[PDB]
Design a protein around this ligand. Structure first.
Ligand SMILES: [K+]
Ligand SMILES: [K+]
Ligand SMILES: [K+]
Ligand SMILES: [Mg+2]
Ligand SMILES: [Mg+2]
Ligand SMILES: [Mg+2]
Ligand SMILES: [Mg+2]
Ligand SMILES: [Mg+2]
Ligand SMILES: [Mg+2]
Ligand SMILES: [Mg+2]
Ligand SMILES: [Mg+2]
Ligand SMILES: [Mg+2]
Ligand SMILES: [Mg+2]
Ligand SMILES: [Mg+2]
Ligand SMILES: [Mg+2]
Ligand SMILES: [Mg+2]
Ligand SMILES: [Mg+2]
Ligand SMILES: [Mg+2]
Ligand SMILES: [Mg+2]
Ligand SMILES: [Mg+2]
Ligand SMILES: [Mg+2]
Ligand SMILES: [Mg+2]
Ligand SMILES: [Mg+2]
Ligand SMILES: [Mg+2]
Ligand SMILES: [Mg+2]
Ligand SMILES: [Mg+2]
Ligand SMILES: [Mg+2]
Ligand SMILES: [Mg+2]
Ligand SMILES: [Mg+2]
Ligand SMILES: [Mg+2]
Ligand SMILES: [Zn+2]
Lengths: 98, 24, 80, 155, 60, 127, 206, 125
RNA sequence: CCGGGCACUCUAACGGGACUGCCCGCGAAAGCGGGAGGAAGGAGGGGACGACGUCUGGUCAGCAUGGCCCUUACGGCCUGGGCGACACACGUGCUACAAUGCCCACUACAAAGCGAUGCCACCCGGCAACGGGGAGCUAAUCGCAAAAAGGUGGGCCCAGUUCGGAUUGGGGUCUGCAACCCGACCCCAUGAAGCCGGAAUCGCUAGUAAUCGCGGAUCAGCCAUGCCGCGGUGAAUACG
């Protein structure tokens, strides 16, 4: 019962990086609950394009926070070896909950 | 109408609650 | 349809300056900038010079004009 | 339509008569997108043309329409500075368009409070030959032709 | 945006209802976002540069 | 046994299951006519059957979510004809001519800036 | 007054961010004011080095701060005498035990910001504008490249009436995403006001 | 029936007909009828001498209505007008008293428009 | 809800698919007009993208900047006032003038978003705004949240009306150091113009217009009927 959520801005890293944790267990743990998607929380920013006036232009910006699950049922004691300090991502965050 | 504080629509439109539009 | 709640606001600048004039009979005039303050009984029979934003307007406070606020008697703008 | 020649969109047949000419009239009766509300008015009126008449509504409908189709009208034009009302025929597509519109317009001009009644009552007076829908029509025609002196301006 | 007014940072308002965001990058005090501490202008600029992680050009 | 089809419209999905029987239809539990109370529309959703003269040979268990009751009515219209095809592929030949097999792509067009709502533009005064 | 930023227009594609790191609505702004302040000092300092880019990565109180330079020499300093000062001067501003690489730019003539700075300098040096531009494009267009372009703002040669000189070679298809055009702006302070140099270098394709 | 001060509502549901009384609105109408048990839906013509009387009683005693209100309201306006009170000044000058703009539309309080001359260029638009 | 299953729906990564490829007619080609097969057919819808340049266009009050100018002040602090004034005129809007409508009941179907010192279920006091107490959320897991138009039932019967809710008395709740000038929000009483708008003039060609409601940024609160998005229902017409 290892719940590890994966939240980031890059759906490629937070994705590859996410499939890093998946194999570092498929060699020492339950078939795992596989990598679960989980809706993305988009944040939009809308601003008048130029300074002073011209209120009818505006440009649209969004901050896409992607998410993941993974989740390794069966608290395998041999998995924490491959899943201890064998990471590589740079813009990813990880939450661990048992 | 959407402008009568004391109607169902009045409340909704003005996005409030009260006697004329209770919170469930 | 006015309001405020439970605690009737008044600035102690002149409060502890209006009652302080009572523990000595009375006085004459009081220069104030706080029109935010609610007129209460211990003022009845006084003369509070409120500020427009330009000058101080004498304001003989009376019985009825209690619940009101000092500013209500110091007209801000000037018109035709 | 500066480029091609615009294709007349095809409507969905009636759910109670499998008629397109009905859906058409129903759309004209329609207000702010509320079709359900519209539809009712129609059928409810069809039921009223049912009671007050042994004839089926669908038939009363068709006839009501048919009588209000104008076959001539006057469109304007600029010549020498003055304006002339040139009488010209009226294509099938337009005849229909003006009919259904005129009915509904004449209908809602009626005195009876209930909608479905007015549509029913106008529809009846229509097939009968009377009614303001037909008056509007006969008028467009009186207008046209009554300028035959300008007909030599074939559109 | 006179320096004397970029004192906002005070946090010594005497009455907290006097506090007011104010862009950290241009001193802007009129269209300052919370999530960035940047005004609508500054936000547009750095966003284009790519100095705001994740922040991409939204389209749909 | 039973046959499946999906069906989506104006952003609303429908789960369709067709089983031989009278002609009863369970939409989200409630009987069809219960769910689609007085909506002159509804009636259409079962059109795929009238097409191949079925109806009186099938029962239908339908689920539906997202959108509005009229969008769903069209979604139901798809599943019914999509399942009805899996059941018997020879049925496509009669459904296509009336295209019940097509997915209506018309969807709420996005709102643009500067415009009051996509296309509807603001009103300019004495230019 | 049109045309979007070539970088901002190509972030998700041919061009990555200059700051990679996730944060929450509570720290994002902070990890920005700072993350920005990092670029503030490094820019004023590592000027002569000719710093093209200043990537910055983060983690649990960690920092990358890879500084890209043409002449890494001035960076590091005598044996290591400087890359130490400016790391202790760095971590002083932000107590985060910050790393600090020093990458080297292979051919600074394909580094739009540099090319811009170059032209910018020459302008403060009372040089002839049109020349620098023509040269710049050449230097860049010669160091390989499938296209290049430079634009100096206005008030050319202190001329009362501002103008806009540019000239370019090869391709600079600003409309195609699948391109990769390093863009670089460089200001140019003077005795008669500012000038703005802009540089484009069409490198790759797909 | 004649409830409050010579008020003669009729041929209409009592609840709504009651409304024709000065100080009586949709709310109080609903009240009085209930706290007197009288189907609101009964036309006034169809009330009862009994019901009517009960109604007349409650209303005229449970509240300050008609002419008495008017005099009272006018009294208050008059009141806060005798003070150097700002609101009072607005009443005197005949302008809105609840902090509304007067640069444009403040008609309902000002009445009809008393148009005048002005400039032409500098698009007053 | 349990068990436990991923098949569906969905979530979100990655791919498949459309090419005038196939069929007939025209053509010299390019490419037309039709047909089949297909979810989709000839840029399938909608975005981001706006050339050399033109208005000596806009912005020195976002910022940057050359040159003038002030320096016990044209710099700085504060309390208070003013940006909210009102004989008038215009732009953009909101709410309407009603029966295809307005109320009150009861019931059904959305999407996007937002939520630490914040969404706030539930319970209790109060007509209510709101107040107490208090579960859950660190958020596909809890909350905002009722979608509304719709449907079923009942009332109103054509009246300035059960239309419309301006204005004005009252009595209150909140935020906030503080609501006189100058805040929303309840509740009672008021219940104004308005019967569809002259000359003129605006938008929109399809999930568009029209109509209904929902969210967010900014933000203590709010004067948002603004703005940027969201999804329900869903037309008319285009000869030319
Ligand atoms: K309406
Ligand atoms: K110019
Ligand atoms: K009025
Ligand atoms: Mg009303
Ligand atoms: Mg207080
Ligand atoms: Mg309807
Ligand atoms: Mg400054
Ligand atoms: Mg504030
Ligand atoms: Mg601010
Ligand atoms: Mg819409
Ligand atoms: Mg470009
Ligand atoms: Mg009354
Ligand atoms: Mg005012
Ligand atoms: Mg060919
Ligand atoms: Mg293009
Ligand atoms: Mg000029
Ligand atoms: Mg101009
Ligand atoms: Mg200019
Ligand atoms: Mg203003
Ligand atoms: Mg409107
Ligand atoms: Mg109507
Ligand atoms: Mg309660
Ligand atoms: Mg209670
Ligand atoms: Mg105030
Ligand atoms: Mg009327
Ligand atoms: Mg068009
Ligand atoms: Mg809103
Ligand atoms: Mg707000
Ligand atoms: Mg206001
Ligand atoms: Mg609002
Ligand atoms: Zn800023």
């Amino acid at each position: 019962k290892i719940r590890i959520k994966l939240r980031g801005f890059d759906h490629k890293t937070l994705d590859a990086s996410a499939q890093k944790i998946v194999e570092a267990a498929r060699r020492s743990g339950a078939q795992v609950s596989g990598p679960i998607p989980l809706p993305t929380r988009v944040r939009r920013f809308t601003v008048i394009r130029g300074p002073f006036k011209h209120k009818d232009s505006r440009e649209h910006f969004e901050l896409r926070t992607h998410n993941r699950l993974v989740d390794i049922i069966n608290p395998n004691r041999k998995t924490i070896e491959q899943l201890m300090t064998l990471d590589l991502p740079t813009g990813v965050e990880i939450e661990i909950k048992t | 109408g959407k402008g009568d504080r004391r109607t169902r629509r009045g409340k909704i439109w003005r996005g409030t609650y009260g006697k004329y539009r209770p919170r469930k | 349809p006015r309001s405020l709640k439970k605690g009737v606001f008044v600035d102690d600048h002149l409060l502890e300056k209006v009652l302080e004039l009572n523990a000595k009979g009375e006085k004459r005039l009081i220069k104030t900038w706080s029109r935010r303050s609610t007129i209460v009984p211990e003022m009845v029979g006084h003369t509070i010079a409120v500020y427009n934003g330009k000058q101080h307007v004498p304001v003989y406070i009376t019985e009825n004009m209690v619940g009101h606020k000092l500013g209500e008697f110091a007209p801000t703008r000037t018109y035709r | 339509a500066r480029r091609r020649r615009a294709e007349v969109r095809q409507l969905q047949p009636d759910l109670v008569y499998g008629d397109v000419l009905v859906t058409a009239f129903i759309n004209k009766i329609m207000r702010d997108g509320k079709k359900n509300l519209a539809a009712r008015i129609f059928y409810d009126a069809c039921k009223i043309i049912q009671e007050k008449t042994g004839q089926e509504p669908l038939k009363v409908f068709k006839q009501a329409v048919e009588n209000v189709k104008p076959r001539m009208e006057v469109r304007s034009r600029r010549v020498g500075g003055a304006n002339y009302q040139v009488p010209m025929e009226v294509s099938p597509r337009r005849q229909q368009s003006l009919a259904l519109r005129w009915l509904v317009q004449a209908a809602n001009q009626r005195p009876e409070r209930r909608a479905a009644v007015r549509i029913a009552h106008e529809l009846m007076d229509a097939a009968e030959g009377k009614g303001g829908a037909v008056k509007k029509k006969e008028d467009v025609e009186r207008m046209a032709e009554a300028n035959r002196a300008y007909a030599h301006y074939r559109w | 945006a006179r320096k004397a007014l970029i004192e906002k940072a005070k946090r010594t308002p005497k009455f907290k209802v006097r506090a007011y965001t104010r862009c950290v990058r241009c001193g802007r005090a009129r269209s300052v976002y919370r999530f960035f501490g940047l005004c609508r202008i500054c936000l547009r600029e750095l966003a284009h540069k790519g100095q705001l992680p994740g922040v991409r050009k939204a389209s749909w | 046994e039973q046959y499946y089809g999906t069906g989506r419209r104006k952003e609303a999905v429908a789960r369709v299951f067709l089983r031989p029987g009278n002609g009863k239809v369970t939409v989200n539990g409630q009987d069809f006519n219960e769910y689609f109370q007085g909506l002159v529309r509804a009636v259409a959703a079962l059109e795929p059957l009238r097409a191949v003269d079925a109806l009186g040979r099938f029962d239908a268990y339908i689920t539906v979510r997202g959108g509005g009751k009229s969008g769903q009515i069209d979604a139901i219209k798809l599943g019914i004809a999509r399942a009805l095809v899996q059941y018997n592929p020879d049925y496509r030949a009669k459904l296509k001519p009336l295209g019940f097999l097509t997915r209506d792509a018309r969807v709420v067009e996005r709102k643009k800036y500067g415009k009051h709502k996509a296309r509807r533009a603001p009103q300019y005064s004495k230019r | 007054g049109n045309k979007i930023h070539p970088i901002g227009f190509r972030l998700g594609i041919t061009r990555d961010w200059e700051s990679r790191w996730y944060a929450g609505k509570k720290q994002y702004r902070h990890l920005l004011l700072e993350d920005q302040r990092i670029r503030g000092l490094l820019e004023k300092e590592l000027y002569s080095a000719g710093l093209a880019r200043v990537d910055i990565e983060r983690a649990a109180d960690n920092v990358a701060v890879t500084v890209h330079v043409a002449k890494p020499g001035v960076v590091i300093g005598r044996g290591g005498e400087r890359i130490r000062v400016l790391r202790e001067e760095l971590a002083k501003l932000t107590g985060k035990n910050v790393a600090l690489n020093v990458q080297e730019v292979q051919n600074p003539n394909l580094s739009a910001p540099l090319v811009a700075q170059r032209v910018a300098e020459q302008i403060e040096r009372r040089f002839a504008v049109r020349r620098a531009i023509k040269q710049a494009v050449q230097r860049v267009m010669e160091s390989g490249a499938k296209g290049a372009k430079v634009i100096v703002s206005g008030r050319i040669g202190g001329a009362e009436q501002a103008r806009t000189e540019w000239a370019a070679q090869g391709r600079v298809p600003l409309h195609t995403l699948r391109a990769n055009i390093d863009y670089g702006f460089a200001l140019a302070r003077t005795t008669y006001g500012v000038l703005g140099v802009k540089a484009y270098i069409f490198l790759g394709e797909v | 029936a004649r409830i409050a001060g010579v008020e003669i509502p009729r041929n209409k549901r009592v609840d709504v007909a009651l409304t024709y009384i000065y100080g009586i609105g949709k709310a109080r109408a609903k009240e009085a009828l209930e706290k007197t048990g009288i189907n609101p839906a009964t036309r006034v013509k169809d009330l009862t001498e009994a019901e009517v009387v009960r109604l007349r009683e409650y209303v005229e005693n449970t509240w300050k209505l008609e002419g008495e209100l008017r005099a009272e309201v006018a009294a208050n306006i008059k009141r806060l007008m005798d003070i150097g009170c700002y609101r009072g000044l607005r009443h005197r000058r005949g302008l809105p008293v609840r902090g509304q703009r007067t640069r444009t539309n403040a008609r309902t309080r000002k009445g009809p428009r008393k148009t005048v001359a002005g400039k032409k260029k500098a698009p007053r638009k």
